[PDB]
Amino acid sequence: SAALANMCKAINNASRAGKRQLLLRFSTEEMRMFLLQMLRHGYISGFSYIHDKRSGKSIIDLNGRLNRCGAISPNYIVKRDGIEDFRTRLLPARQFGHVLFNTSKGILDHKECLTENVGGKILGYFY
Amino acid sequence: PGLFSANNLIKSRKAKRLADTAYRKRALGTKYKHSVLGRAPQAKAIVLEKIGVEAKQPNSAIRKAVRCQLIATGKKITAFVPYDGSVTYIESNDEVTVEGFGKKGRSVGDIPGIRFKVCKVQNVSLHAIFTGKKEKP
Amino acid sequence: AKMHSSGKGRSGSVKPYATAFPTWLTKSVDEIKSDVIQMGNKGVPAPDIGTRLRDEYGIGKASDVLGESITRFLQRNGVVPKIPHDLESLVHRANTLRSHLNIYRKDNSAKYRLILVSSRMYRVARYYKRKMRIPGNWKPKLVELN
RNA sequence: GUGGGGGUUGGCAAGUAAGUUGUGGGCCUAUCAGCUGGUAGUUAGGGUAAUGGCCUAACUAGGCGCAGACGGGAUACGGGG
RNA sequence: UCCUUUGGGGAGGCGGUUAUGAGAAGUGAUGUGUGUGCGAGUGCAAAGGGGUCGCAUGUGAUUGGAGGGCAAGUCGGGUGCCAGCAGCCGCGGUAAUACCUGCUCCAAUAGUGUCUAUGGUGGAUGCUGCAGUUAAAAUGUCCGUAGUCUGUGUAUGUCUUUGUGUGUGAUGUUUGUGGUUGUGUGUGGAUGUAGUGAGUGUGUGGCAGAGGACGAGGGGCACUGGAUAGUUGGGCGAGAGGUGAAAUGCGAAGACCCUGACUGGACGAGCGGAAGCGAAGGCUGUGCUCUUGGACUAAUGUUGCGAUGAAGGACGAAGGCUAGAGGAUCGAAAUCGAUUAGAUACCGUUUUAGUUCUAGCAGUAAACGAUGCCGACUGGACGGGACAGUGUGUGUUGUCCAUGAGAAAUCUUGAGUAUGCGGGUUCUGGGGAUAGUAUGCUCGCAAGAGUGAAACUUGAAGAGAUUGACGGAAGGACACCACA
RNA sequence: GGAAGGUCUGAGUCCUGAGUGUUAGAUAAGAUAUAAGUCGUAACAUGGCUGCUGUUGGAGAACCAGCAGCAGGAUCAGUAU
């Protein structure tokens, strides 16, 4: 989760400069679960990663649609009744944005966690 | 600030709080040690002398005060007699009730060194004698 | 990001992805094994064995000929040193500083080196005791300062 | 019980009450850092309505501590509120 | 109402007294008194009260303010830096919108002001969520244990156990604070399900070893260069030295200057730089020797052995102190001569401790880039130093321009990466002054260092920049009230 | 305990030793607010000897001198035959 926060600062830097692609010289397993949840929601075009028997590599394809992404350290523990307070602190409006949690069913955003009756540890957000 | 670090944060933030002066008098239990009337809001006293004090410049004046004796603790204090021509109702060996000024234990205005204020004179309000509602003692 | 200095250099080797077995070998595979096991008996340290294999035999990765690493091969053949090479180089460096300081007392430069060299040796010893490679009561054998 | 020796009618089960005991919690303070002799334990007996150093005899050398012991201070009855 | 239910009960009930809080009505009105008094009935153990009727009857506002903050007067008359007012800023010296007195108006109203404690105000204690180049604040430098972080304690269904409070429905005590009455919620535990499967293999950070180079990094030994001073041979014949100008002081027992020989301590010029090395303090003659560092280059070994760091430890300019050695130059203290109104000073003469080396103590600096450590990411231009390659790369480093940031000056491997606020882990600050002062304790031969208050006082103290005024400030022009 | 007495619990009296507060004292060193002053002029301009930090000696008083350091300076800089 030190690799998750490093990735979000490098994405904010390129999305502000108008880049199309981003190459990072590292790649972890839960860094790739966070990126697969931005792809199915429409915020990036795609990505791909290389195997080199070093720390890994990853290439992100940006879109033009991202306003910001972040990570929360440390990963607090939130019951299913406390999901909704973390949403009013992190997203600008009530109609868009996604807060992601690491639950006992995988990685879900805050709309799914309410339709499955679970809580977990917070990872990050993006809008 | 890890998730298992709450004993390091209570230890650290309690020590920073002592740098606040108002909090430090309460936490160490020494808020009423050096105080001429302790925990009372008003106090009685008997009048020894009747003096006049200069205003602090740039103001020209002479403010009328009295030297008293606190009946409860035997400490000497000076107090200020507010209104116009009102220092002449009191005599010596009179009893008087004094109270604060209202600014946390500092002096107010151009009056140097005085932290108290005469309120009554032998159980009669001093402000009512000046407006004509009551009669002098 | 070095341990005891602010150095940030990046030099060093990079081994290939997915090597193979050498065809250009001149000797036999069984004639090479009996020589890696000979040099281990003369007390040659394992980082220096791999430098002879590379420079004189054509073996770039000995895990493709011996079937495993160098110091696991020597172990099955009954050659297990009393202390590993990492730890014993550091005892030896800390003895040559201690006996220079016995003749030249005013060398304040070497007295500072002795502190850093020797706290690096107690950190490496603590690792081999957690891992059960030396006894729990091992002490370094040291020249005695005067 | 192949002798004898005690007691003077006092019970059972529910209900109600009471005693004893384990762990856990933000008053302030390091110009308070080392503390402890029935003190930590074992074995026997006494006492108790009842477990237990609760108490005694003999023997072992233990027990607590920067995750704050042992001390000292301020207008300290604890909760529901 | 209960205990002991016609016995007992200062438990408990009933009034009275009191600006304790909270709620609800009044102080009038034109068609036809919201008050007070009395009379019936009701009520109670006996009575007050209250509400259902009638009879007369007619009464009932204050407290704090009017210069700004802050709603409301340059209205009359008095006083003249007086008397007084004013939480804060401020007013008053014969021209008071601020004091005293009279009118008029403003806010709330059976209430409205004052003194004291406390929540908010305060992102001015900061978990969310502050600041630390110059405003208060990163510690002189490395090493390092506990702890934190990294490497290899969760959610939820069902059941159970506990609140007098409270969230939220219903219900015309005439309305209301209320009362009655439906439903939800607070802490621990038991038993299932899900995450959840486990060490393996690989070698990404570090460490250890290899190769050829680079460096005023350190200790020791042996030599060397000239200048200052002095001793001693030869020459000369009256002043030399230093100052704004001179005086004390030195010179015919021959100074100063020029020459042949020697002795001694200290120092290492020029080359010498926005060049190198060391943890920092610091380090420039030559040759030997024992030790040392970082970078680079690579199909070597190992396999996470790591980051930060109260407690502990070592090192640390100059001055000072303790013992021995040494003594060229300079020089506190002392002393005379000048200058001056006076100079115990600046300038000078005579003369010391000290300045050097060896062995130690001590522990401070504008010990400064006034700028924690580690990790991720980011435009150009011209350079330097080392290594390796061949048209480039890695580690370091100087100058100049954007973007971005900032209170600005300014910053460019950071003082950048959004109040769009969370990468790991420490320290220090919380208006000024009292004061780094008292007192206790630890260390020192001492000189002192480290840690570190309060009473009392006070409305600003401070940062960066703007326009003026001034300088016993620097330039460029000028002029017979300036020179030639 | 037949008694003389023994045992347990133990207030109180008399004496010594720490602690934690509060307070009187001849003399006497500071701090702060004043008045109304006396003596000088250390700092701010190259403030008339540039200024400041540490250390050690000295003076009626500000302060002065020696050794090293800093610019928050009065210099971001000047022609190698």
UniProtKB/Swiss-Prot annotation, chain B:
Keyword Aminoacyl-tRNA synthetase attributed: no
GO biological process: translation
Family: Belongs to the universal ribosomal protein uS12 family.
Matching PANTHER family: 30S RIBOSOMAL PROTEIN S12 FAMILY MEMBER
A cellular component term, taken from the record's GO annotations: small ribosomal subunit
Organism classification: Eukaryota, Fungi, Fungi incertae sedis, Microsporidia, Unikaryonidae
Native source species: Encephalitozoon cuniculi (strain GB-M1) (Microsporidian parasite)
A Pfam cross-reference name: Ribosom_S12_S23
Annotated positions of the Hydroxyproline modification: P58
SUPFAM superfamilies: Nucleic acid-binding proteins
Keywords: Hydroxylation, Ribonucleoprotein, Ribosomal protein
UniProt protein name: Small ribosomal subunit protein uS12
UniProt GO MF annotations: structural constituent of ribosome
Keyword Ribosomal protein: yes
InterPro entries: NA-bd_OB-fold (IPR012340), Ribosomal_uS12 (IPR006032), Ribosomal_uS12_euk/arc (IPR005680)
Curated annotation (Swiss-Prot), chain C:
InterPro entries from the UniProt entry: Ribosomal_uS15, Ribosomal_uS15_arc_euk, Ribosomal_uS15_N, uS15_NS1_RNA-bd_sf
Keywords: Ribonucleoprotein, Ribosomal protein
Biological-process GO terms, alphabetical: translation
Gene3D superfamilies: 4.10.860.130, S15/NS1, RNA-binding
Domain of life: Eukaryota
A cellular component term, taken from the record's GO annotations: cytosolic small ribosomal subunit
SMART domains (UniProt xref): Ribosomal_S13_N (SM01386)
Any GO molecular function: structural constituent of ribosome
HAMAP family to which the protein is assigned, alphabetical: Ribosomal_uS15_A (MF_01343_A)
UniProt-listed PANTHER family: RIBOSOMAL PROTEIN S15P/S13E, SMALL RIBOSOMAL SUBUNIT PROTEIN US15
Family: Belongs to the universal ribosomal protein uS15 family.
Name of the featured protein: Small ribosomal subunit protein uS15
UniProt organism field: Encephalitozoon cuniculi (strain GB-M1)
